Every structure is written in C-alpha cells, then in structure tokens.
Coordinates of C-alpha atoms and ligand atoms in Angstrom, one line a residue:
X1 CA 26.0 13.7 11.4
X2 CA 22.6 15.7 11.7
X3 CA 19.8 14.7 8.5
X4 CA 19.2 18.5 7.1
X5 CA 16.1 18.7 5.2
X6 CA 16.7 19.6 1.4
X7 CA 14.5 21.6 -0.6
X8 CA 16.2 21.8 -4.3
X9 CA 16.1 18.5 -6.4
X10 CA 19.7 19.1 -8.4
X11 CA 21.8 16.4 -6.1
X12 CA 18.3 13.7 -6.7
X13 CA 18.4 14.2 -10.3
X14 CA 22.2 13.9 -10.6
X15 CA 21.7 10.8 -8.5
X16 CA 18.8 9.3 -11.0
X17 CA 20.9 10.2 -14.4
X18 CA 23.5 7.5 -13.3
X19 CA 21.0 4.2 -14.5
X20 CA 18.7 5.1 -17.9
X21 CA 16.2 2.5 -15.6
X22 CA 15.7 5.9 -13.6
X23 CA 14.1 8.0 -16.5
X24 CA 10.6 7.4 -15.9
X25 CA 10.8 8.1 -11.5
X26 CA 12.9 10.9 -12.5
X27 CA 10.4 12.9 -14.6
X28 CA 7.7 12.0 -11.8
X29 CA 9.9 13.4 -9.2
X30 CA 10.4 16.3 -11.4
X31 CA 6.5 16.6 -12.3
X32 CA 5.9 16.7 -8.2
X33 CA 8.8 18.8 -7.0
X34 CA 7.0 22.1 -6.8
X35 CA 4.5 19.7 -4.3
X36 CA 7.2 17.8 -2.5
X37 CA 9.2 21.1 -1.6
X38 CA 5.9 22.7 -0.4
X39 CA 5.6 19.5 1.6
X40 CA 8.7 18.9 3.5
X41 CA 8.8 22.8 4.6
X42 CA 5.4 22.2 5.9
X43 CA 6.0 19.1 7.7
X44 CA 9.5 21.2 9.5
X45 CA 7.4 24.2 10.3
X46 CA 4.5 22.1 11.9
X47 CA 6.7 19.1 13.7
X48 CA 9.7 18.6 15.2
X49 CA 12.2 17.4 12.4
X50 CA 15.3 18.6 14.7
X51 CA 18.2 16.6 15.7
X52 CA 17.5 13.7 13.5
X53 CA 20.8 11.6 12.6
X54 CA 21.1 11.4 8.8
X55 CA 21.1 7.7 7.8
X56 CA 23.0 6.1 5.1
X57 CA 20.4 4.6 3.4
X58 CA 20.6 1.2 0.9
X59 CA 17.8 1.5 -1.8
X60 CA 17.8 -1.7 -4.0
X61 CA 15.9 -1.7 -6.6
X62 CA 16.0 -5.5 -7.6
X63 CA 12.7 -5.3 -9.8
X64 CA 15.6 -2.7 -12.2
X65 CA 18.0 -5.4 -12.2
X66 CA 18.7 -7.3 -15.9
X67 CA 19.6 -10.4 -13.6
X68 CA 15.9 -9.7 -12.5
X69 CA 14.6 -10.0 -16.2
X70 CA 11.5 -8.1 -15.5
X71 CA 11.9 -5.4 -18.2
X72 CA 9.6 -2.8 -16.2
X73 CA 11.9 0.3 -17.8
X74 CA 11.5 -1.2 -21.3
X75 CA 7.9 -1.1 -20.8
X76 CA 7.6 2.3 -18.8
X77 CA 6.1 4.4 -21.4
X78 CA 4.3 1.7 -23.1
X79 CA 1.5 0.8 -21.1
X80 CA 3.3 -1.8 -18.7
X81 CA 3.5 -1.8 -14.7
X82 CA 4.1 1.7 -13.3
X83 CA 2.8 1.1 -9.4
X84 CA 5.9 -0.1 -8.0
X85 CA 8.0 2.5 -9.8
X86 CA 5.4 4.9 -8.4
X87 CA 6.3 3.7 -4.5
X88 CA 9.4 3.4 -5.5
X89 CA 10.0 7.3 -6.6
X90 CA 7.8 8.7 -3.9
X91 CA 10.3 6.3 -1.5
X92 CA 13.6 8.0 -2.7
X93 CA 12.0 11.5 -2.8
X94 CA 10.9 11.5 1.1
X95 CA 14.1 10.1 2.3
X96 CA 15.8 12.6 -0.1
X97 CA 13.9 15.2 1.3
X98 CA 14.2 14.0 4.8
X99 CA 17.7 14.9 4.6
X100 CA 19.0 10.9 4.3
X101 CA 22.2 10.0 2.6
X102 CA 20.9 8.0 -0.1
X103 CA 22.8 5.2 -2.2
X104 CA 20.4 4.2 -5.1
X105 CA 21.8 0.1 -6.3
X106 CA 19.8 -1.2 -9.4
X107 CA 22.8 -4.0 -9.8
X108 CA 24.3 -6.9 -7.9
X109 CA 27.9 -4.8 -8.6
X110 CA 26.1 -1.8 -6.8
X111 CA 24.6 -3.5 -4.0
X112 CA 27.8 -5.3 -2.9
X113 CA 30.1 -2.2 -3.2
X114 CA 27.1 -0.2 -1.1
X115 CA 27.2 -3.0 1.7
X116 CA 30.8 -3.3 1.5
X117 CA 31.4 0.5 1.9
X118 CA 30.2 -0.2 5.8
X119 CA 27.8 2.2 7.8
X120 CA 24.4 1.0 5.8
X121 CA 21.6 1.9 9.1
X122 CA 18.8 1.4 6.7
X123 CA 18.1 -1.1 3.6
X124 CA 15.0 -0.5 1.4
X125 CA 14.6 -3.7 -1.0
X126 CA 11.9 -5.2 -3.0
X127 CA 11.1 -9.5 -3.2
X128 CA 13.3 -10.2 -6.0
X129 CA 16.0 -7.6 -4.5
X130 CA 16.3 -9.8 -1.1
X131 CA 17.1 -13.2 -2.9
X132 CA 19.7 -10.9 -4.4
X133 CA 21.0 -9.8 -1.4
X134 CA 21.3 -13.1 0.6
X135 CA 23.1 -14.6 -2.8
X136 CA 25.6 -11.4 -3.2
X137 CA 26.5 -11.1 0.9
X138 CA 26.1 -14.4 2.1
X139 CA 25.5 -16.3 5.3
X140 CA 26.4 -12.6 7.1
X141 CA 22.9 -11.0 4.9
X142 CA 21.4 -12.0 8.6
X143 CA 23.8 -9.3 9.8
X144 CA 21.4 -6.4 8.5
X145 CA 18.5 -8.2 8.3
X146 CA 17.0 -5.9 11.0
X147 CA 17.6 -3.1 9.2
X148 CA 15.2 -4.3 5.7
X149 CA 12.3 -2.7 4.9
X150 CA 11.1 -5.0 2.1
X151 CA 8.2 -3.0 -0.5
X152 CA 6.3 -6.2 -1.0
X153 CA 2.8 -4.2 -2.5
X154 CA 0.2 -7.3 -1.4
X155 CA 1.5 -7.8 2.0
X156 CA 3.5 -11.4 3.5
X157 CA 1.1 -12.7 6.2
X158 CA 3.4 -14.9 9.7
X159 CA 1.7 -17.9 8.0
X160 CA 3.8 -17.6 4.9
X161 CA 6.7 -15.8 6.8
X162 CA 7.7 -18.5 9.0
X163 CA 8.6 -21.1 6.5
X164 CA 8.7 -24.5 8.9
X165 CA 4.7 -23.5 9.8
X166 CA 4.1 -22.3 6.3
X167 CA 5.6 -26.1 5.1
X168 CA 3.5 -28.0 8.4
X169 CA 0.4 -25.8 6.8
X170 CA 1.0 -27.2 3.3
X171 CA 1.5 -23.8 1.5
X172 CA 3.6 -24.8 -1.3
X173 CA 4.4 -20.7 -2.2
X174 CA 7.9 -20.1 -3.3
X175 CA 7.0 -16.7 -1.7
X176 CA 7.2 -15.8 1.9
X177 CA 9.6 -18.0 4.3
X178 CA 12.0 -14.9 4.8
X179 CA 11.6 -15.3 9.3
X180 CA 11.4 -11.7 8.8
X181 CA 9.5 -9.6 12.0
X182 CA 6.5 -9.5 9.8
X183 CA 5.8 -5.3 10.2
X184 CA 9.5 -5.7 8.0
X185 CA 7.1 -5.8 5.0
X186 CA 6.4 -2.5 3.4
X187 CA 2.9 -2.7 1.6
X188 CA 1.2 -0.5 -1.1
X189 CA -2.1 0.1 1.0
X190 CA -3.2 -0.5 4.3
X191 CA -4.7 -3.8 4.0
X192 CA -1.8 -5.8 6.1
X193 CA -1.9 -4.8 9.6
X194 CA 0.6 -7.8 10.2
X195 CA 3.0 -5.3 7.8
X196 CA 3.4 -2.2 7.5
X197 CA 1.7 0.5 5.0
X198 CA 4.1 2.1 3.0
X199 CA 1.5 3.6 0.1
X200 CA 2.9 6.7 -2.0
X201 CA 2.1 10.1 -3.2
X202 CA -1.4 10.7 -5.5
X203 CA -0.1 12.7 -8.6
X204 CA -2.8 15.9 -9.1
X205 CA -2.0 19.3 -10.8
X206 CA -5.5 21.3 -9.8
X207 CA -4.3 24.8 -8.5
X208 CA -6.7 26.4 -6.2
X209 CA -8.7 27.8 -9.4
X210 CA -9.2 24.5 -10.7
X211 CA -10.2 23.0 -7.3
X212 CA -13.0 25.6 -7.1
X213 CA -14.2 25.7 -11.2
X214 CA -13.9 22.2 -11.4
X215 CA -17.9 21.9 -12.6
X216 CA -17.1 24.1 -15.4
X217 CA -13.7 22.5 -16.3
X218 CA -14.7 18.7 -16.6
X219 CA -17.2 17.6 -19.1
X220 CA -20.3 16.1 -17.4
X221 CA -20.8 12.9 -19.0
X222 CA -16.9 12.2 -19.7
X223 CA -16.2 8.7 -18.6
X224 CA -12.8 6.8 -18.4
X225 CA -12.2 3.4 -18.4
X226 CA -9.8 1.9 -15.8
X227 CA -8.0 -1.2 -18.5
X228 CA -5.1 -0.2 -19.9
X229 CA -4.3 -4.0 -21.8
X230 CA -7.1 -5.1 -24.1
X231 CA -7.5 -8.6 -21.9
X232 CA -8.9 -6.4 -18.9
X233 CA -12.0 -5.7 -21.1
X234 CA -13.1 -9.6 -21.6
X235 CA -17.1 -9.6 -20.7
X236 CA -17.7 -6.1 -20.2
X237 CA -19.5 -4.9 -22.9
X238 CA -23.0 -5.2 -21.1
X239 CA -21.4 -3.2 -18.3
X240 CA -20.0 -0.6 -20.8
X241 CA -23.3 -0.4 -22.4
X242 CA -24.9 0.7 -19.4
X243 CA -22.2 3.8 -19.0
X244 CA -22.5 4.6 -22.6
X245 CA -26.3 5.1 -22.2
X246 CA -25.2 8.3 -20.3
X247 CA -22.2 9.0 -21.1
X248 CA -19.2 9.0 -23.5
X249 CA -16.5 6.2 -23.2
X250 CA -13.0 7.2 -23.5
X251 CA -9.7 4.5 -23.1
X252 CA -6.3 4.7 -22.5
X253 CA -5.6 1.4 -23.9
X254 CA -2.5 -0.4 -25.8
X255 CA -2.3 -1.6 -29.3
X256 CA -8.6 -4.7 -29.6
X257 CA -11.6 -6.6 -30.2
X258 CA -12.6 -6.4 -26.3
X259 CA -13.3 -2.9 -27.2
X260 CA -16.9 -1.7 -28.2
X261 CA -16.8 0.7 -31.4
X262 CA -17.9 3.6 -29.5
X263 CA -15.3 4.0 -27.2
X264 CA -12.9 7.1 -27.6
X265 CA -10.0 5.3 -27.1
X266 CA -6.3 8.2 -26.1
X267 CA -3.7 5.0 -26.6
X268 CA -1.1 5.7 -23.4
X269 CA -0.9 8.9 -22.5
X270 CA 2.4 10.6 -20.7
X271 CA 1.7 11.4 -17.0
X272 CA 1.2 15.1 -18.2
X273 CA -1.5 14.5 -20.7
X274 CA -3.2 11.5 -18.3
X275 CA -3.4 13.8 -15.7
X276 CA -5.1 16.6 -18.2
X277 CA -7.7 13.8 -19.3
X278 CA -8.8 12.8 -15.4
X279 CA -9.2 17.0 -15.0
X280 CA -12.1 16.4 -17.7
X281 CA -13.2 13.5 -17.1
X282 CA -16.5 12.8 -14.5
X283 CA -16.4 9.2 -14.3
X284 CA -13.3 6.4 -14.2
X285 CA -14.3 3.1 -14.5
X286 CA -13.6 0.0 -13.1
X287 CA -13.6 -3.4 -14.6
X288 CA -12.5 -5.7 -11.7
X289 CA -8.7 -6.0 -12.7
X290 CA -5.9 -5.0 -11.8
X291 CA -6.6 -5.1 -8.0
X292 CA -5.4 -2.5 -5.6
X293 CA -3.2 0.2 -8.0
X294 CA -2.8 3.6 -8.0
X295 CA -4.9 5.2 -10.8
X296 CA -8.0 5.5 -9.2
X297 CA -6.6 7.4 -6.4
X298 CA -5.5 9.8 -9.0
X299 CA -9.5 9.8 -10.7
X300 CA -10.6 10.5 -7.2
X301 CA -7.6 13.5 -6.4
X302 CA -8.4 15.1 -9.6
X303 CA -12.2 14.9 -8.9
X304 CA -13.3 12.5 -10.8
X305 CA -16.0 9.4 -9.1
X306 CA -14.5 5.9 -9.2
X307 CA -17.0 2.8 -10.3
X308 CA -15.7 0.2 -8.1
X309 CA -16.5 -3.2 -9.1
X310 CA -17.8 -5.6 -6.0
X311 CA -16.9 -9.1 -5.2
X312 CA -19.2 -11.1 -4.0
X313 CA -17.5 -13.9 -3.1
X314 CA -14.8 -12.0 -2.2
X315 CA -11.6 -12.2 -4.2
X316 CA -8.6 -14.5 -2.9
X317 CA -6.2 -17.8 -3.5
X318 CA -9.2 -19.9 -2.7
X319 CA -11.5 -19.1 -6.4
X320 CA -8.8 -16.3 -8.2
X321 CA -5.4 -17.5 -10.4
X322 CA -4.0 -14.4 -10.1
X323 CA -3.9 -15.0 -5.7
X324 CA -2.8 -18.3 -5.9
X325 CA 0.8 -18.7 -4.2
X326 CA 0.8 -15.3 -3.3
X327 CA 2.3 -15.6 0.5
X328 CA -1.3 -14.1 2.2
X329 CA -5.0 -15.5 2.7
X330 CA -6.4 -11.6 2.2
X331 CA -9.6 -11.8 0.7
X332 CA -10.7 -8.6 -1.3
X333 CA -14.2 -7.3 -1.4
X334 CA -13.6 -5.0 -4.6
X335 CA -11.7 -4.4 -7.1
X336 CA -10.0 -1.7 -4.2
X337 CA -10.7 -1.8 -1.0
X338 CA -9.2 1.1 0.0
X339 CA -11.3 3.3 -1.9
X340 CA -14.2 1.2 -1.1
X341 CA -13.8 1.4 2.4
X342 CA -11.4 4.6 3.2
X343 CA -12.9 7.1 1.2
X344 CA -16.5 5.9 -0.3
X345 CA -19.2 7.9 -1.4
X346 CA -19.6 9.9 -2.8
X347 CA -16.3 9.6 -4.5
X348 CA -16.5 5.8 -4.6
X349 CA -19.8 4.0 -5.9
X350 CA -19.0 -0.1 -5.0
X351 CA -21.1 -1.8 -7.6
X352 CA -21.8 -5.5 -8.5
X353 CA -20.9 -5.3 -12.3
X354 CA -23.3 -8.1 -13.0
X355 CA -26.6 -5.8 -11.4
X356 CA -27.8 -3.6 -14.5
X357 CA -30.0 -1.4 -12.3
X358 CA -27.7 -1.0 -9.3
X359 CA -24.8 0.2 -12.0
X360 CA -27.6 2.6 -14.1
X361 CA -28.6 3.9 -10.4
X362 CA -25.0 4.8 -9.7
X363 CA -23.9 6.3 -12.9
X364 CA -27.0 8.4 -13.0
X365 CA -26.4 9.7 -8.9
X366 CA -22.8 10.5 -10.5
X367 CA -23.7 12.3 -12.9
X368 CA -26.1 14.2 -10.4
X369 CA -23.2 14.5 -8.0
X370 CA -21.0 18.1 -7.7
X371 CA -17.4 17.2 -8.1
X372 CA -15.1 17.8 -4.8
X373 CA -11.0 16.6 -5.3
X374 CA -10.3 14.5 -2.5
X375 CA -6.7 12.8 -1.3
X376 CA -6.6 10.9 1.7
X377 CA -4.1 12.8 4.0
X378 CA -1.9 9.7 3.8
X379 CA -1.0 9.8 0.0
X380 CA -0.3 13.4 -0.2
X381 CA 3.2 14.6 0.1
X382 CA 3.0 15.6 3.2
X383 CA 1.2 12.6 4.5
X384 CA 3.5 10.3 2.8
X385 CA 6.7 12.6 4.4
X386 CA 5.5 12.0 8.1
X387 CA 4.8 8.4 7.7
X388 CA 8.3 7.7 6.2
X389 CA 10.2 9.7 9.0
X390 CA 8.3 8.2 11.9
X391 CA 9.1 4.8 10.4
X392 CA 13.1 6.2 10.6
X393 CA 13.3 7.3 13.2
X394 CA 10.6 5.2 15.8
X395 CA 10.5 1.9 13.9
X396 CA 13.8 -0.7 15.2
X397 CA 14.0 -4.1 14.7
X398 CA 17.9 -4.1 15.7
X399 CA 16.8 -3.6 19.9
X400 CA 18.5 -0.4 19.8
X401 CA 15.7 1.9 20.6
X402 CA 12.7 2.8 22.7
X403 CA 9.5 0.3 22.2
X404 CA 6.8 1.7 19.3
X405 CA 4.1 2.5 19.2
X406 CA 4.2 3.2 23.1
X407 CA 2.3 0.1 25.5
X408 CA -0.3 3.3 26.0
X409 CA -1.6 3.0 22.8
X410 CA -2.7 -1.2 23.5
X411 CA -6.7 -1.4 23.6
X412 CA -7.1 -5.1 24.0
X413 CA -10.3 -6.9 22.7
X414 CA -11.9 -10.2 21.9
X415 CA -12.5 -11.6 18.7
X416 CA -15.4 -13.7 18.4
X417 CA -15.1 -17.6 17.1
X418 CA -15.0 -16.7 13.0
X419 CA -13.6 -13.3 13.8
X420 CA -9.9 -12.0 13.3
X421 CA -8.1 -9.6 15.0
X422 CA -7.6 -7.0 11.7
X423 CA -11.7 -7.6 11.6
X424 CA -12.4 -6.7 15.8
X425 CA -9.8 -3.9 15.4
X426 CA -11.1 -2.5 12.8
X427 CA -15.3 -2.3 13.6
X428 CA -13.7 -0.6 17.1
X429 CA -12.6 2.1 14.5
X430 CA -8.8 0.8 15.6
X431 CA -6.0 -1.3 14.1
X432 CA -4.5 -4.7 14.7
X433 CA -1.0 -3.9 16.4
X434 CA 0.8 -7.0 16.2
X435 CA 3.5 -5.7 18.6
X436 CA 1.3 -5.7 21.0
X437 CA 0.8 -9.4 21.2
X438 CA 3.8 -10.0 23.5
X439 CA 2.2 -8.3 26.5
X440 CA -1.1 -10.5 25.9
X441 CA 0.4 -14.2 26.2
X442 CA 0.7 -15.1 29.6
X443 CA -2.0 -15.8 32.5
X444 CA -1.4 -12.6 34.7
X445 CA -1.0 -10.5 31.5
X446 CA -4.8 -11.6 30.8
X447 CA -6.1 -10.5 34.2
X448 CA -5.1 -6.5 33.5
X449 CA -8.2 -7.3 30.3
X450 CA -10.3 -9.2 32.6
X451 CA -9.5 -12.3 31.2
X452 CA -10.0 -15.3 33.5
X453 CA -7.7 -18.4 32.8
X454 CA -8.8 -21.5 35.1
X455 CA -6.2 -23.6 32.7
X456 CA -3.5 -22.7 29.8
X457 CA -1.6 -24.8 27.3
X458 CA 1.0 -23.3 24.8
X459 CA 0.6 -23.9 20.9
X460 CA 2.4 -22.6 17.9
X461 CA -0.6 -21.5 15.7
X462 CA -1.3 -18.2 14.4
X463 CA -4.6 -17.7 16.1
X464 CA -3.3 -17.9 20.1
X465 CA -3.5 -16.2 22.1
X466 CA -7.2 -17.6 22.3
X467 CA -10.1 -17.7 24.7
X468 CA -12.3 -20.9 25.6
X469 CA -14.5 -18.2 27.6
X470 CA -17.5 -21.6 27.9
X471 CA -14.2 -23.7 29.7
X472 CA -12.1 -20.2 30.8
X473 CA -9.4 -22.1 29.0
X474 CA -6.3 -20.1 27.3
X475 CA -4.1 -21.3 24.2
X476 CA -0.8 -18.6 24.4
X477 CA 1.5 -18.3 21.8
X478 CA 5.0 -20.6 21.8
X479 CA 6.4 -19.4 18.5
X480 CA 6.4 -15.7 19.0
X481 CA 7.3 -15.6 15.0
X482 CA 3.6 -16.6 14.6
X483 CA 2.0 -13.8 16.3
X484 CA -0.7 -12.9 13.6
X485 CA -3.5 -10.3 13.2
X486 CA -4.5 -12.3 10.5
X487 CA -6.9 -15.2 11.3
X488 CA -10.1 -16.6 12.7
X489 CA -10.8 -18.9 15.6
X490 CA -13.2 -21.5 14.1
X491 CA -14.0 -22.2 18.4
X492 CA -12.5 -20.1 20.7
X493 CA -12.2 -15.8 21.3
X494 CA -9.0 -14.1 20.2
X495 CA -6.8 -12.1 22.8
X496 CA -6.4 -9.2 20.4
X497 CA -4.0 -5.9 20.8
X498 CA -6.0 -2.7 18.9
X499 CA -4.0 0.7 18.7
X500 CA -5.4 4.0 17.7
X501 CA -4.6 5.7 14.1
X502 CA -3.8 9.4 13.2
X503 CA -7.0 10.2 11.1
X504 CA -6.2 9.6 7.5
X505 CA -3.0 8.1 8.6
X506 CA -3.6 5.0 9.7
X507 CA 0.0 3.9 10.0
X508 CA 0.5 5.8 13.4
X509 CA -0.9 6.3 16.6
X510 CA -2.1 9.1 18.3
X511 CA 1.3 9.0 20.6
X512 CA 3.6 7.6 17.4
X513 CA 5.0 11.1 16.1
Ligands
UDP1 O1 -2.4 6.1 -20.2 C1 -1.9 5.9 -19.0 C2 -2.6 5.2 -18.1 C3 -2.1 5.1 -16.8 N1 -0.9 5.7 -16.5 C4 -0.4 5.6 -15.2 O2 -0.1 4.3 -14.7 C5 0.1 4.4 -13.3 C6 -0.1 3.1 -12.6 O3 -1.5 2.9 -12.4 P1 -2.2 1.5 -12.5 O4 -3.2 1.6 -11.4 O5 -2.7 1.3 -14.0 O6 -1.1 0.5 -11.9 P2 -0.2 -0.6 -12.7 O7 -1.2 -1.7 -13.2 O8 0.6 0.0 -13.8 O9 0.7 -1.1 -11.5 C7 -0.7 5.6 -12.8 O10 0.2 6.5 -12.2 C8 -1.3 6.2 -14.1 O11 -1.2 7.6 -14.1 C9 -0.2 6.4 -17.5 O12 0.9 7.0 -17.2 N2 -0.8 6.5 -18.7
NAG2 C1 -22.3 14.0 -24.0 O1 -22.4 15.5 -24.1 C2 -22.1 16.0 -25.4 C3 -22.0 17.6 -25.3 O2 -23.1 18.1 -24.5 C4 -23.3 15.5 -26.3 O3 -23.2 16.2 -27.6 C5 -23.2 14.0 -26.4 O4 -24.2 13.5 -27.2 C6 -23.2 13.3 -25.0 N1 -22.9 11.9 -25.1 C7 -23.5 10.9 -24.4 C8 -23.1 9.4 -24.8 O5 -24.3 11.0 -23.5

C-alpha cells in the first residue's frame, strides 16, 4: 500500500506495447531513461519520498482515441503535433517513477473497465477525454470529478469555467463550462496562474564533455528555423534574408514555395538526429507560429539562442483566428512567453520581425555570444518529478487533506484600476494564488491587509474582491466559482492573494514540498 520508487523501465514499456498509439512516447521514454532514473534517485536521496501511499492512477488519453478522430499517432513521425504526446510521456514516466500504479486507457472500452474496477484516487485526462468520460460513466462522472487533473496545454480561465457566467458574458466557446475548481486544469507552461503548470521534461543529450566544448562542437553561423509545415513560412522571406546575411539557413520542414532557395532544408528528422542538428546548430529561429511549444526549450537546453518573434499588439481572441473560442482572454507578448520572460538573454533575443535593424543587431550579438546550455530547473527530470509528486500528494480537491499551499505563504496586494492580479503578483516577483481568495472576501478579513471598508455589497464577477479606496467601498465575491487571478478592474483596486515560488519552480511555494 506504500508507492516504492522504480528505477528500471521493463514493467513501462510492457505497459506502452499494449496500444501501437504508444510507439512514439515509448521510444521518448526510452531515449530519456538513462536521465529519468538519474532523476528519481536524486529527488529520494535529497527529499523525503517516504511513506507515500501508491495511488491507482486513471490516465486517459482521449486525444489516442479513434472515436476522438484526431490521428496524432498516424502523424507522429511525419511532421504533425508532438507537444501533447511530449506532456503526455513525461506525465506517465514521473508517476511511473513515483512508484504509482498506473492504468494507461486510450479507449472508451478501457476507460470504463478502469473506472469500473473501483479504487481510481487519481484521473489524468485531456479535453476531448472528459466529454468521454461524462458520456461513458454518466450522471455519477461527478463522483470523481475531484480527483481530474485535466492537461488542457493553453489554460481554461473561471470566466469560461463557469458556464452560466461564461453564457451571461456572451462567450459563445464550446470550450470551458466544465464548473471544474479551476487549479483542476493542467497547463503546458506557466502562463495560467488560475490552473495549474504541468509543463514536461526538455529532451538534451550533451554529456559533460559536450557541455564544456560546446564552442568547438556547433558551427558558428548554423541557423535553424522553428516551421515545421510550409504555411508557417508565409511573409518571411525579408526576415530570412536578414539571417542569411550571416548565417546559413537550415529547415526541418514537410513535403514548398514559402521557402527561399538557399535554405538547407533536413525534411523531419527522428528525435535522435533532431537533437544531433540543435548540438550544431547556433541559432533556432522563430517565425511567430506555433505559439508556446516545446522545441525551443530544446534549442535553448542544447545551447543553441532562440529568435523570438515580438507582438506588438499582443496576441489573443480579440485580432488572432487561431485564439478565438479558445476558453481564456490570455494575451501573448511573443511568439513564447516563457522563454521571453523566464529565461531571456542571452539565450532568448525578443525581436519585432518587422524591425530589420533590431533583428541584424540581434543575430550579429548571437553570433558574438559564447554558447552556455541552459534548462529551467522546472523542465528537467528532476524538476518535472518534484512538481508532479507535490501535486499527489499536497494537491485535494475531494476535502480530504490538509489546506495547500499553507495560509503562511498568502502576501496580499492591490491591484491598481487596469491591473490584474497574475500582473501585481507577478512585478512583486510572486504568483497569483487563487486559493487564497477565500480568506480575502469578507470585511474583517480585509482589516488583517489594512483594508478599510466603510460599505460592502456582494457581486458575482470575476474581478471582486475589489477596492473603491476614493469611497473605501468593497465588492466581495458571491459566486466563489468565479474567484479569478485573471482580470482587470477598469475603476476600482483588486484584493489580490500573491504566494512565493521555489526558484525555477514556480508551481510551489517555499513551504509547498
Ligand atoms: O524535425 C523535427 C522537428 C521537430 N521535432 C519535435 O517536435 C516536438 C514538438 O515541438 P513543436 O514545438 O514543433 O510542437 P508541436 O507544434 O509539434 O506541438 C519537439 O520535441 C521536436 O523535437 C521532431 O521530432 N523532428
Ligand atoms: C558559414 O561558415 C562556412 C564555414 O566557415 C562558410 O564557408 C560559409 O560561407 C558561411 N555561410 C554564411 C551564409 O555565412
């Protein structure tokens, strides 16, 4: 009844052989294991991984589904969608590791046999996967909802959540509406601090040799564009231009007349020989789509800079097709904000495509630059392996448990009018803890944050609690299903709850392990 930590991949692999869908997490997993095993006996020696209880675990895999028809296995080695099946490999591997009892479902039959079989603590699920699993259990689906954690890579913000307010709003979405506790939702970066940051592992194979010859390995003016799919390239050829003033132009791209003559194009290349190309290669290059995937992660862990393309206007529903009805009002200031922001330069030059000279000024700094391999402690195994069990073992929806993070890690501030609480968390160097908003909604809760209210009303909005500070009048929250992190008061302050993050884990608290 006590989760043992495994080190030896033979039960995993067994496990994957059972659906051909598997093949192309299996030979990640196997790619990493030397890295993952490393990982998970570092993680035990360092931190107390002692008297866990060892879940049984529900991994659906709805996007794997035929009923699904999204045919991301038939498209695997082609050049098609790989970053869910990347979160979704480095998701099995850490609860593997962790010691879990893990029931992989990539079928309706599956999933209702799994569910059926009783004593399911745990249910990792994707978007399409939940519809499945309300139509295959029924009205009782509510039973477990408690127990989802739904990978849902761009984040579900309460607006969209709640689906009365989402309808009274005039979102007309078929996404969101799940009345979900919002931090259910499992997301690919940490842009959502209404969710919770899931993220994966960064693939690199530099040994400690490689690490420290890594100026004499890669090929100075090697460049790599980011665009795997012709389409990506549209308008780009000034940009391109620019690079190929000073450097060579290499692709990894299927099938193209988007595509300047000059460019040294690989076709797709297997993880192995992909990974072997960003060792060379000095530069990878953005060219503003797709938004917020893993590959550039990978250019940055294997040493190479990343040419992020800017947005100015920022990038949302409001001016971009590719946001609209997606359940969330994030804007994105580049084509990914987590490099932009989390790691930077020198690693990460944020460039307005459009600005010749601000693009020939970055590509010629790069090429000045000495090359250091860099992984955010958060996507390395390791990382990844304490995020995952402090989410097991802290993280409970069902009541059953102690409250997390702990109230000792609440830093209350105010938002200005125009200013959200992600945005006044995060310039305190903090994050938006939306658990925190219960303790904040009530006038002798405001007084402990010297917060004066004269007069209070109730509203069910997603930016209350909120501060008249001019009238010393407070709006508190009466749908507690729209507490949101998310959102600007036009008029009034914010009563915001801030938490501390773990540097380079920005999931957890100080106090959260
Ligand atoms: O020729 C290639 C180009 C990319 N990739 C992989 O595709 C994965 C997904 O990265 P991307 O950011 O392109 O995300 P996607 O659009 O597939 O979700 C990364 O792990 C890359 O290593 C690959 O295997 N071969
Ligand atoms: C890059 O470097 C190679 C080898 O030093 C050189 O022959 C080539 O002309 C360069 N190409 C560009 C576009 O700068």
């Amino acid at each position: 009844s006590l989760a043992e930590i495994r080190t030896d991949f033979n039960i995993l692999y067994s496990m994957m052989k059972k659906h051909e869908e598997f093949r192309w997490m299996r030979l990640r997993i196997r790619r990493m294991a030397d890295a993952w095993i490393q990982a998970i006996k570092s993680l035990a020696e360092k931190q107390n991984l002692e008297k866990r209880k060892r879940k049984k675990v529900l991994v659906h895999l709805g996007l794997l589904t035929k009923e699904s028809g999204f045919k991301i296995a038939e498209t695997a080695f082609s050049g098609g969608p790989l970053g869910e099946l990347v979160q979704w490999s480095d998701l099995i591997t850490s609860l593997y590791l962790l010691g879990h009892d893990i029931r992989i479902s990539a079928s309706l039959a599956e999933l209702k046999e799994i569910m059926g079989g009783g004593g399911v603590e745990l249910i990792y699920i994707d978007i399409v996967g939940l519809a499945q699993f309300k139509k295959t259990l029924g009205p009782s689906w509510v039973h477990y909802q408690c127990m989802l954690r739904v990978l849902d890579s761009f984040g579900t913000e309460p607006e969209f959540n709640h689906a009365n307010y989402a309808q009274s709003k005039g979102h007309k979405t078929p996404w969101g509406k799940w009345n979900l506790n919002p931090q259910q939702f499992y997301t690919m970066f940490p842009h959502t601090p209404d969710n919770s940051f899931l993220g994966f592992v960064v693939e690199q194979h530099l040994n400690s040799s490689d690490i420290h010859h890594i100026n004499e390995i890669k090929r100075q003016n090697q460049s790599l564009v980011y665009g795997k799919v012709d389409s990506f390239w549209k308008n780009k050829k000034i940009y391109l231009d620019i690079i190929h003033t000073y450097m060579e132009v290499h692709a990894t791209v299927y099938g193209t007349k988007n595509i300047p003559s000059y460019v040294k194009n690989h076709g797709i290349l297997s993880g192995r020989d992909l990974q072997f190309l960003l060792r060379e290669t000095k530069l990878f290059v953005g060219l503003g789509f797709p938004y917020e995937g893993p590959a550039p992660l990978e250019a940055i862990a294997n040493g190479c800079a990343f040419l992020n393309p800017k947005f100015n206007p920022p990038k949302s529903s409001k001016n971009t097709d590719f946001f609209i009805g997606k359940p969330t009002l994030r804007e994105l200031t580049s084509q990914h904000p987590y490099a932009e922001v989390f790691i930077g330069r020198p690693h990460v030059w944020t460039v307005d495509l459009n600005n010749q000279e601000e693009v020939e000024d970055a590509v010629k700094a790069i090429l000045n630059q000495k090359i250091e391999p860099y992984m955010p402690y958060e996507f390395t195994c390791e990382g990844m392996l304490q995020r995952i069990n402090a989410f097991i073992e802290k993280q409970d929806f069902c009541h059953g448990q102690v409250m997390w993070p702990p109230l000792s890690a609440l830093q209350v501030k105010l938002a200005e009018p125009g200013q959200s609480c992600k945005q006044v968390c995060q310039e305190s160097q903090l994050i938006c803890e939306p658990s925190f908003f219960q303790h904040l909604n009530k006038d002798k809760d405001m007084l402990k944050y010297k917060v004066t209210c004269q007069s209070s009303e109730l509203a069910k909005d997603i930016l209350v609690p909120s501060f008249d500070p001019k009238n010393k009048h407070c709006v508190f929250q009466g749908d507690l299903l729209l507490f949101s992190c998310a959102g600007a008061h036009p008029r009034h302050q914010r009563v915001c709850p801030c938490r501390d993050f773990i540097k380079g884990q920005v999931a957890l608290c100080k106090d959260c392990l």
